[PDB]
Amino acid sequence: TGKGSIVLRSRTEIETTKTGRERIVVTEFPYMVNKTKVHEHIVRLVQEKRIEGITAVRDESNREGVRFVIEVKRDASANVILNNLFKMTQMQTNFGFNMLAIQNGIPKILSLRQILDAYIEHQKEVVV
Amino acid sequence: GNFGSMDGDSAAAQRYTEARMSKIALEMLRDINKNTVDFVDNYDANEREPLVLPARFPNLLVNGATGIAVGMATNIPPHNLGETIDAVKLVMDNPEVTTKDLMEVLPGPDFPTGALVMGKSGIHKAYE
């Protein structure tokens, strides 16, 4: 029926240094996300004083491949912080659908079958 | 390299001097490999450092202090190696020592140069 929002998360990992310090490393984000607006929102979350542990908010070398790194001190429960990311931050995405069709002017709505059905009969008329 | 004396000497040759580890430092700072001292991370989040050190003598007494007056400065006079050892042995053997005991195992504070200290009760009020 083409309606509803679904949950989406970023490829995000905890990585250990040569010192044993942990690092939140993201690779990408879901659809319609800025690096920089979320980065400003991270700097907010720093000055909003509603999240702890976070030390380094860094991003470099991104043109050979996207690399944004948050780095957090020890004794902080970093996976709980990842849970707090995908609760409150915009890194979590509630991506909604709406596919309300139009077939010859009048508005309609289709299943995935019916789309391909109209495609089939169009190809019929095309090749004929 | 150039270091001068108590003369008014200015050795501007900075890296041109030679130095490395000293003999007293060798046994003075062992036991790092024995988890003896705690550590903190730098601001650079890459390497650690200890806030205190392990000791093989109270260098407090071996080298004095010439402070600055952030609230007030501090003079602390130097002393002797074996006299400090005998003081350690004295306090070890007796938890009931006196200040005359300190007069015995420390006849007086000394210098790398030498002077004359004629007073007695000033020394008494100094150590008390």
3-state SS record for B3-62 = CCCCCCCCCCCCCCCCCCCCHHHHHHCCCHHHCCCCCEECCCCCCEECCCCCCCCCHHHH
Q: What one-letter code names the amino acid at B42? A: N
- Residues of B carrying an active site annotation: 16
Expressed in Å, this structure's resolution amounts to 5.2
Chain A to chain B, count of Cβ pairs less than 8 Å apart?
Answer: 11
CA distance A16 to A23: 6
Phi-psi region of A45 (alpha: psi -120 to 50; beta: other; left: phi over 0): alpha
Say yes or no for a CB contact (<8 Å) between B46 and A19: yes
CA distance B61 to chain A (A): 36
Say yes or no for a CB contact (<8 Å) between A21 and B41: yes
Q: Of all helices (H) and strands (E), which one includes residue A87?
A: helix A78-88
- Which chain A residue has its CA at the smallest distance from B42's CA? A73
* Helices marked H in B17-79: 23-28, 59-62
Task: For CA atoms A73, A78, A84, A86, give the dihedral sign.
Answer: positive
DSSP B64: -
